[PDB]
């Protein structure tokens, strides 16, 4: 995978606005959308109306239904920081099943990939050295996290 | 149905892709002319039919699942620095599952509405519209009915709210074999998340003692989408004290091309 | 300068116990010290007696005499973290002369080098992305901080 | 006296070094036979005589100013991976000043005492021994008398405490033209520093909620060098939760060669 580029957004904006790419993708059939493709839309953001103030009752319902619920953060993000999510999740008041512990890429490995807590009904994971967009900073660790989630199995302790 | 949406090849595609791809539009409202665009990357595994199905969504509100999720984070390809060639991502998540990327709501990326009042959205309407995309995609792709299904993504609002609507409607759409949800980097409760932001910024050396003290006294309780002018005044001092760092990854180098594509603090 | 090596301690242990090096340095004349050269002594650490609990009265006597007093931290250190020094220095209750601000290598430069507060009598500086041993991680930034200290000039604002 | 201390050249030394170097022992107790080793790198400047004089000290207590200060951090040379030859450091601090490294107290590095009981030290005896060193170093190097002088280094105790003994004796030794001090990463007040440690570790995701609340309840007040059993029990759980990170630089990679040279948690 190439080294990190803080200007990489510009490459998919150029690529996704190429006419031949839109044809192959079956997107913007016959120029039907009049503005160009861009990554985020300011008008959807400025015009948003109802935004809930508390999703914790939605979480109690999903956990009551017996659904697998996992949440994770990158620890160098300051927009939604680790402290915000830890305080919100701690307010659900769930029983701890596996206490806060460091996880490794394999039980025999030495570099901490991040830390994790398992409550009864919910697993929380942090990824060390990763920003808001975790897979662009730590791709191997995000892939391991996705595989463990699909299995329903904890992140590897040593 | 699906055959028309089959993507046979993409410009700048590297030489060995072996998994199937589909892309097109699903109309979710015939009267208003509202349609969502999706890109599907099948599992690059020996038996694709064994792998689960995963819906990925980015948030903001307002950002693209294809522009962030597929092309910069977890999809099979990344775009080269020449803006014309693709390269394969060895940690692509379709190595463990069939991944569906949808741009939602209409007005994001390639998704659109012929009625512009449709571009004024809200949380409950976003969840109803994306649930409707889902039941209509399953009708176009019936070989995924009853397959093990997960919802994943970067929005503390869209992923728990869509999950609640799928679950409440399970007797109406029994063929969606919903197993669980994976939430990344998301807002969860306005009061608790506002206290943790002012605290973490101070313990990382990003703000002053007095921005922290004022922030904790006037901002907890404010909405992030509809802020009061009292808290906007402290919030704005906080961000000026932080300087020219990228707030999404505070130790990395910053991009030099000045007309930045991100014009709002997308959450 | 070569990139960061986490194992660089071992190169110094080896070079400083070479006999030709001890000769050129005029160190350990005639094999006078029994034990070999090492970076740190466990016997000095373990036999340590009297250790003060509060240095703030010493800081007040040096500031009052008009001596230049600067303090700095690396912000990825967890042994004496930025939070600990921030709280101890704040307990001096000195008036602020320049409020917390980001500093750059030059006023025209783009990347944040760290943050700084100037009180009446004491300057505090953090170096972004540097651990406890600040010059091994951020050498250029530590040289600039040294030069500003000698001139008695604040770290460059924008 | 100083001419005998001149270092003519080091094994493995690079080709362009133009500055002067001196090294040797200064006996601070004739009776017990106690002596400190020093290495002096002069300013690499157009007129070194114009440049100030700075004493650099590392802390621990117990670690070496030459091993840490000079060879890995701010000195003129850096060691190659073969452990046998040297390279020039272009951000060396002797490009702006004359830098004096002393290993202190005796027992550290090359510094020794011929009376064994001298190796049990305390804060006041350390400041007195390094002040005596300084008075005696100036008589060997009489041309640095009254040069603009600064004390800098990595110990929250040694740098303020030696500065207080130099300052209180300025009418006794006026030739030490003491201008100020630079303190790096140091312990300053046991109570405030201890609250700051448990709070910073929690806000960086290193410890659990309950290690943080117990730590804040039993440890502020305790000494770092002589802790109560109550606080040691919490402290050891906290170091366990952090795992195998390097605690001096929490985001970098760890050294594989695990017979580590550092066997204590040096402050
Ligand atoms: C939004 O309005 C546009 C323009 O009226 C619709 O596209 C046009 O639809 C008419 C009637 O089907 C067709 O004759 C035009 O060729 C077609 N495109 C243009 C440029 O006029 C659009 O819906 C239609 O889009 C076309 C491409 C096709 O897929 C058709 O099946 C579809 O109904 C309207 N969008 C929606 C969601 O209704
Ligand atoms: C610690 O004791 C040793 C051993 O007595 C001293 O070195 C020896 O000193 C005697 C008498 O000066 C001399 O004849 C020996 O040749 C000398 N070295 C050895 C291996 O015995 C040492 O102090 C002395 O160290 C020598 C190298 C020299 O610098 C001399 O000037 C100095 O007095 C004692 N350490 C101290 C700090 O006194
Ligand atoms: C759709 O195509 C037209 C040209 O045919 C282009 O100007 C417009 O920007 C495109 N819209 C998107 C979203 O790419
Ligand atoms: C001093 O020299 C002796 C004899 O060569 C050696 O064995 C010893 O380890 C040395 N001590 C130091 C501190 O280098
Ligand atoms: C410099 C990167 C900025 C990316 C901003 C996008 C955050 C939007 C929410 C999300 O999908 O995560
Ligand atoms: C991996 C680096 C560990 C360095 C440990 C020594 C810290 C001692 C005090 C000092 O900074 O002088």
Short mmCIF file of C-alpha atoms in Angstrom, two decimals, chain C residues 1-2 4-18 20-22 24-29 32-33 35-59 61-62 64-89 91 129-137 139-147 149-151, chain D residues 4-7 9-11 23 25 37 54 56 60-64 67 71-73 78-81 83-84 86-87 89-93 95 97 103 105-107 109-112 119-126 150 154 156-158 160-161 164 167-168 178-186 188-190 192-193 195-197 199-201 225-226 247-257 259 261-267:
data_model
loop_
_atom_site.label_atom_id
_atom_site.label_comp_id
_atom_site.label_asym_id
_atom_site.label_seq_id
_atom_site.Cartn_x
_atom_site.Cartn_y
_atom_site.Cartn_z
CA UNK C 1 20.27 12.54 10.62
CA UNK C 2 19.35 8.78 10.29
CA UNK C 4 14.63 6.90 14.67
CA UNK C 5 15.98 3.58 15.89
CA UNK C 6 14.35 2.21 19.14
CA UNK C 7 17.49 0.09 19.76
CA UNK C 8 20.11 2.87 19.52
CA UNK C 9 21.03 2.57 23.31
CA UNK C 10 23.06 -0.58 22.40
CA UNK C 11 25.38 1.26 19.99
CA UNK C 12 26.53 3.59 22.80
CA UNK C 13 27.00 0.74 25.34
CA UNK C 14 29.34 -0.91 22.86
CA UNK C 15 31.34 2.16 21.75
CA UNK C 16 31.94 3.51 25.27
CA UNK C 17 33.38 0.11 26.55
CA UNK C 18 35.94 -0.11 23.69
CA UNK C 20 40.80 2.69 22.60
CA UNK C 21 37.79 5.00 23.10
CA UNK C 22 38.28 5.13 26.89
CA UNK C 24 41.15 8.92 23.82
CA UNK C 25 38.53 10.17 26.29
CA UNK C 26 40.91 9.89 29.31
CA UNK C 27 38.12 7.93 31.07
CA UNK C 28 38.76 5.01 33.52
CA UNK C 29 42.51 5.61 33.79
CA UNK C 32 40.20 2.17 38.09
CA UNK C 33 36.39 1.29 38.01
CA UNK C 35 32.11 -2.46 36.67
CA UNK C 36 31.65 -1.68 32.92
CA UNK C 37 30.21 1.49 31.43
CA UNK C 38 26.41 1.52 31.32
CA UNK C 39 23.75 4.25 30.67
CA UNK C 40 22.07 4.16 34.04
CA UNK C 41 22.98 2.78 37.55
CA UNK C 42 20.55 0.70 39.46
CA UNK C 43 22.62 0.99 42.67
CA UNK C 44 22.34 4.85 42.67
CA UNK C 45 18.56 4.60 41.93
CA UNK C 46 18.00 1.92 44.60
CA UNK C 47 20.11 3.51 47.36
CA UNK C 48 18.55 7.00 46.93
CA UNK C 49 17.57 8.65 50.12
CA UNK C 50 16.23 12.18 50.56
CA UNK C 51 13.94 13.31 47.58
CA UNK C 52 11.96 16.59 47.84
CA UNK C 53 8.18 16.52 47.37
CA UNK C 54 7.62 20.10 46.21
CA UNK C 55 9.87 22.25 44.02
CA UNK C 56 7.55 25.31 43.65
CA UNK C 57 9.21 27.39 46.48
CA UNK C 58 12.52 27.02 44.58
CA UNK C 59 10.87 28.27 41.32
CA UNK C 61 12.91 32.18 44.64
CA UNK C 62 14.57 31.96 41.19
CA UNK C 64 11.94 36.69 42.10
CA UNK C 65 15.68 37.03 41.59
CA UNK C 66 15.00 37.69 37.90
CA UNK C 67 16.65 34.59 36.37
CA UNK C 68 15.43 33.36 32.97
CA UNK C 69 13.24 30.22 33.60
CA UNK C 70 11.93 28.09 30.71
CA UNK C 71 10.28 24.58 31.06
CA UNK C 72 9.32 22.24 28.13
CA UNK C 73 7.66 18.80 27.56
CA UNK C 74 7.39 16.29 24.69
CA UNK C 75 3.62 15.54 24.26
CA UNK C 76 3.74 11.76 23.50
CA UNK C 77 5.59 11.00 26.82
CA UNK C 78 3.47 9.07 29.50
CA UNK C 79 6.19 9.14 32.30
CA UNK C 80 5.94 12.91 33.09
CA UNK C 81 2.94 13.83 30.87
CA UNK C 82 2.03 17.45 29.71
CA UNK C 83 -1.00 17.28 32.11
CA UNK C 84 1.25 16.92 35.16
CA UNK C 85 3.56 19.88 34.38
CA UNK C 86 0.53 22.09 33.29
CA UNK C 87 -1.11 21.56 36.69
CA UNK C 88 2.09 22.04 38.80
CA UNK C 89 3.10 25.29 36.98
CA UNK C 91 -0.19 26.36 40.98
CA UNK C 129 4.99 14.56 18.37
CA UNK C 130 8.03 14.23 20.73
CA UNK C 131 8.50 11.79 23.65
CA UNK C 132 10.43 12.29 26.98
CA UNK C 133 13.81 12.59 25.20
CA UNK C 134 12.77 15.50 23.00
CA UNK C 135 15.92 15.81 20.70
CA UNK C 136 15.79 12.14 19.66
CA UNK C 137 12.31 12.59 18.11
CA UNK C 139 15.74 17.49 16.62
CA UNK C 140 15.07 20.64 14.50
CA UNK C 141 12.38 21.87 16.77
CA UNK C 142 14.53 21.24 19.88
CA UNK C 143 17.46 23.26 18.39
CA UNK C 144 15.11 26.21 17.62
CA UNK C 145 13.70 26.12 21.21
CA UNK C 146 17.30 26.19 22.48
CA UNK C 147 18.16 29.24 20.35
CA UNK C 149 15.80 30.41 25.11
CA UNK C 150 19.33 31.86 24.81
CA UNK C 151 17.90 35.06 23.16
CA UNK D 4 46.30 17.41 29.60
CA UNK D 5 42.49 17.10 29.18
CA UNK D 6 42.57 17.92 25.44
CA UNK D 7 41.01 15.19 23.30
CA UNK D 9 40.45 12.70 18.21
CA UNK D 10 37.99 9.85 18.76
CA UNK D 11 38.14 6.33 17.09
CA UNK D 23 37.60 15.34 28.87
CA UNK D 25 38.23 13.85 36.04
CA UNK D 37 34.03 12.62 34.72
CA UNK D 54 25.83 25.65 29.13
CA UNK D 56 23.79 19.77 30.49
CA UNK D 60 16.85 9.37 36.62
CA UNK D 61 18.31 9.68 39.27
CA UNK D 62 21.24 7.55 37.98
CA UNK D 63 21.52 8.07 34.20
CA UNK D 64 24.44 9.48 32.29
CA UNK D 67 25.24 8.37 27.25
CA UNK D 71 25.56 10.47 22.26
CA UNK D 72 21.83 10.06 21.63
CA UNK D 73 20.35 13.62 22.00
CA UNK D 78 25.78 10.13 17.05
CA UNK D 79 26.94 6.41 16.97
CA UNK D 80 26.54 4.16 13.86
CA UNK D 81 24.75 0.75 14.23
CA UNK D 83 28.84 0.45 17.71
CA UNK D 84 32.29 1.49 16.46
CA UNK D 86 30.53 8.14 14.59
CA UNK D 87 28.56 10.64 12.45
CA UNK D 89 24.64 15.61 14.23
CA UNK D 90 23.60 18.71 12.16
CA UNK D 91 21.16 19.83 14.94
CA UNK D 92 23.91 19.68 17.56
CA UNK D 93 23.48 22.35 20.29
CA UNK D 95 26.39 25.14 16.86
CA UNK D 97 26.93 27.38 22.59
CA UNK D 103 28.23 12.43 34.68
CA UNK D 105 26.55 11.63 40.92
CA UNK D 106 29.71 9.37 41.35
CA UNK D 107 28.60 5.76 40.54
CA UNK D 109 29.11 5.99 34.02
CA UNK D 110 32.82 6.77 34.45
CA UNK D 111 32.38 8.80 37.68
CA UNK D 112 33.36 6.84 40.85
CA UNK D 119 26.87 5.77 46.58
CA UNK D 120 23.84 6.32 48.79
CA UNK D 121 22.78 9.86 47.76
CA UNK D 122 19.94 12.36 48.35
CA UNK D 123 18.85 15.64 46.67
CA UNK D 124 20.82 18.02 48.81
CA UNK D 125 24.08 16.06 48.66
CA UNK D 126 23.74 15.88 44.81
CA UNK D 150 23.17 28.51 31.87
CA UNK D 154 16.28 16.45 31.99
CA UNK D 156 12.85 18.22 37.59
CA UNK D 157 14.95 18.04 40.80
CA UNK D 158 18.60 18.47 39.78
CA UNK D 160 16.23 23.88 40.02
CA UNK D 161 18.18 22.64 43.06
CA UNK D 164 19.44 27.55 43.89
CA UNK D 167 22.40 31.59 43.06
CA UNK D 168 22.74 31.66 46.93
CA UNK D 178 24.60 32.64 36.02
CA UNK D 179 21.81 33.81 33.65
CA UNK D 180 19.07 31.12 33.84
CA UNK D 181 17.78 27.55 33.47
CA UNK D 182 16.02 25.31 30.95
CA UNK D 183 14.12 22.31 32.48
CA UNK D 184 12.97 19.34 30.31
CA UNK D 185 10.27 16.79 31.21
CA UNK D 186 10.61 17.03 34.98
CA UNK D 188 7.83 19.31 40.04
CA UNK D 189 5.23 18.71 42.85
CA UNK D 190 4.25 15.14 43.95
CA UNK D 192 -0.24 17.78 41.22
CA UNK D 193 1.96 15.57 39.12
CA UNK D 195 -3.31 13.64 39.58
CA UNK D 196 -2.00 14.66 36.15
CA UNK D 197 -0.60 11.11 35.51
CA UNK D 199 -5.93 11.70 34.22
CA UNK D 200 -3.61 11.87 31.23
CA UNK D 201 -3.32 8.06 31.02
CA UNK D 225 10.67 7.55 45.13
CA UNK D 226 9.20 6.09 48.40
CA UNK D 247 6.04 4.57 28.10
CA UNK D 248 8.54 7.35 27.14
CA UNK D 249 7.09 7.66 23.51
CA UNK D 250 3.79 5.91 23.28
CA UNK D 251 3.22 5.75 19.53
CA UNK D 252 6.64 4.45 18.32
CA UNK D 253 7.91 0.86 17.84
CA UNK D 254 9.56 -1.07 20.67
CA UNK D 255 13.11 -2.54 20.57
CA UNK D 256 13.09 -6.17 19.82
CA UNK D 257 16.48 -6.85 21.59
CA UNK D 259 17.80 -7.72 27.48
CA UNK D 261 19.56 -1.64 29.51
CA UNK D 262 16.82 0.10 31.53
CA UNK D 263 15.71 -1.92 34.47
CA UNK D 264 14.08 0.78 36.59
CA UNK D 265 11.32 3.35 35.79
CA UNK D 266 13.76 6.27 35.61
CA UNK D 267 11.96 9.56 36.14
#
